[PDB]
Amino acid sequence: HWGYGKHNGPEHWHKDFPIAKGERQSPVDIDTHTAKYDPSLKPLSVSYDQATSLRILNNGHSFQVTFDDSQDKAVLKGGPLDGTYRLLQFHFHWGSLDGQGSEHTVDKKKYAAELHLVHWNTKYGDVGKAVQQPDGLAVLGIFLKVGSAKPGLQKVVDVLDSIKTEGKSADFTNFDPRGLLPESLDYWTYPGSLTTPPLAECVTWIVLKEPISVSSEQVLKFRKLNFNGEGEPEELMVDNWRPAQPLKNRQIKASFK
Ligand SMILES: NS(=O)(=O)c1cc(NC(=O)Nc2ccc(C(F)(F)F)cc2)c(O)c([N+](=O)[O-])c1
Numbered sequence: 001h002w003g004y005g006k007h008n009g010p011e012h013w014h015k016d017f018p019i020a021k022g023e024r025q026s027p028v029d030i031d032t033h034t035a036k037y038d039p040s041l042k043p044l045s046v047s048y049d050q051a052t053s054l055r056i057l058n059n060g061h062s063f064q065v066t067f068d069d070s071q072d073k074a075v076l077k078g079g080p081l082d083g084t085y086r087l088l089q090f091h092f093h094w095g096s097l098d099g100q101g102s103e104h105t106v107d108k109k110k111y112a113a114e115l116h117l118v119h120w121n122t123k124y125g126d127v128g129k130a131v132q133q134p135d136g137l138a139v140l141g142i143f144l145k146v147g148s149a150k151p152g153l154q155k156v157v158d159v160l161d162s163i164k165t166e167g168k169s170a171d172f173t174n175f176d177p178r179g180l181l182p183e184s185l186d187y188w189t190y191p192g193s194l195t196t197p198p199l200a201e202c203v204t205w206i207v208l209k210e211p212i213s214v215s216s217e218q219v220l221k222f223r224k225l226n227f228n229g230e231g232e233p234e235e236l237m238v239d240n241w242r243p244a245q246p247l248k249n250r251q252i253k254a255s256f257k
């Protein structure tokens with residue numbers, strides 16, 4: 001199946017997932033001079049104090065931390081969104097070198113990694129229904145640059161040895177995702193898609209302007225994960241990012257001047 005290699009990477013995905021060539025695909029390059037300030041946008045409302053993390057897992061293309069989404073415990077509201085969206089999981093995309101790894105770019109600048117917090121619209125009842133709707137998901141995207149360490153990330157870093165290969169999972173309770181947020185919640189937003197198969201065009205993207213800083217030692221440990229399963233030849237999990245897609249007839253809106 002699909003992946004990020006020469007023979008099964010993003011340039012191949014359209015053969016199995018023809019929506020890869022669709023009209024609202026992600027990621028995109030954010031041109032800061034053509035983004036449109038929109039004064040009708042509201043501040044984001046991030047309510048994560050009651051979040052219940054469950055598991056951390058290596059799914060063969062990234063690693064994810066999952067949350068209990070059976071109640072309104074960790075929700076995203078406001079911004080460009082109508083309604084309440086529940087946090088389901090977060091995961092990262094990263095590079096083999098510090099100058100690549102993010103999926104979105106800003107004036108063509110690539111960051112070392114990108115954090116995606118995936119939320120789904122509770123009006124649709126479960127996440128499987130939400131992925132079939134044009135407003136079903138909201139993904140909060142946060143850029144990572146290399147610099148000072150991020151203390152709130154260290155406990156994710158320290159458990160990655162236990163999920164090195166695809167299919168491994170571990171208990172990962174009492175993790176507070178508020179420690180992954182930058183100080184400012186100013187954002188760009190646009191209508192887009194999942195950046196992995198099935199590439200469904202169901203996502204309101206909210207990309208934060210302010211990156212978080214992580215240390216070289218922290219991102220190094222991402223690069224030690226494996227795409228392969230246990231007992232298979234080692235293949236390092238790096239460069240699990242999709243390149244920017246055509247913007248087509250979309251406008252990126254900014255919440256700030
Ligand atoms: N956590 S999420 O981003 O919001 C998210 C939600 C769903 N929900 C589905 O109901 N169905 C589905 C879609 C495609 C496949 C297929 F065809 F890929 F196998 C299989 C099943 C999902 O599939 C994925 N996903 O990644 O597939 C991600």
Ligand SMILES: NS(=O)(=O)c1cc(NC(=O)Nc2ccc(C(F)(F)F)cc2)c(O)c([N+](=O)[O-])c1
Pocket residue numbers: 059061062063064089091092116118127128139193194195196
């Ligand atoms: N970049 S992205 O478009 O946001 C993105 C989406 C997915 N897919 C899912 O999360 N699938 C999924 C999650 C839960 C269910 C459940 F539990 F509902 F069945 C069903 C399906 C993903 O694995 C990654 N990734 O890199 O790991 C990135």
Ligand SMILES: [Zn+2]
Pocket residue numbers: 091092093116195
């Ligand atoms: Zn992602």
